[PDB]
Amino acid sequence: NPRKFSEKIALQKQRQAEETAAFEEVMMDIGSTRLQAQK
């Protein structure tokens, strides 16, 4: 891994923003999930 801490913090924050983006998008569709699941 890169030595300079700016690059380590950059990696951690970028990965965290990406995983949080995918997680937020995934959690947006549970309402329609439970609605279409009952019909």
Binding site: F5, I9, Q12, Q16, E19, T20, F23, T33, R34
Partner: protein
């Protein structure tokens, strides 16, 4: 010129420590976030599995 050659090193050590501690705080923050995300995902999985029963 050796005196300034040690002065710039002294100054660089400070910013290196700052970036070190900041980086560790970033890691711990990321761990907490990932823990909350994990707990939420696991709970939603339990809910959707109970949805079939």
């Amino acid at each position: 010129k050796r005196e300034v050659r040690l002065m710039k090193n002294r100054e660089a050590a400070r910013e290196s420590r700052r970036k070190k501690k900041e980086y560790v705080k970033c890691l711990e923050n990321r761990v907490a976030v990932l823990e909350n995300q994990n707990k939420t995902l696991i709970e939603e999985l339990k809910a959707l599995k109970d949805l079939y029963s």
